[PDB]
Amino acid sequence: IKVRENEPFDVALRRFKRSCEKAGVLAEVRRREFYEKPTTERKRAKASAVKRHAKKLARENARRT
């Protein structure tokens, strides 16, 4: 998070923030995640992941493109 970038540079470049937190504090602990809803919304985000990964093996179809 603590980013100095030497001296001649300036131009922000603080992906250190964007690839660490921000979303963790904000879109999660902004408004209440009703205990069960995480368990629901994760398990569908988890089931959607393996749906794509299992399809990615069977994606090699005829195509003809």
Partner 1 sequence: RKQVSDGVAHIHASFNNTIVTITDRQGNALGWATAGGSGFRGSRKSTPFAAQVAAERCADAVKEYGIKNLEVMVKGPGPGRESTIRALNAAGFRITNITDVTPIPHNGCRPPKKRR
Instruction: Summarize as ranges the residues that interact with Mg ion (CB under 5 A).
Output: 36, 39
Please check whether residue 19 is in contact with residue 3, taking contact to mean a CB–CB distance below 8 angstroms: no
Kindly state the smallest distance separating residue 44's Cβ from partner 1, in Å: 17
CB-CB contact of 30 with 19 (8 Å): no
Q: Which of 1, 11, 13, 50 binds RNA (CB under 7 A)?
A: 50
Report CA dihedral (54, 60, 64, 65) to the nearest 10 degrees: 70
CB of 34 or CB of 56, closer to partner 1: 34
CB 26 within 8 A of CB 45: no
The pattern of x and - marking residues 5 through 44 that bind RNA according to CB under 7 A reads -------------------x-------x---------xx-
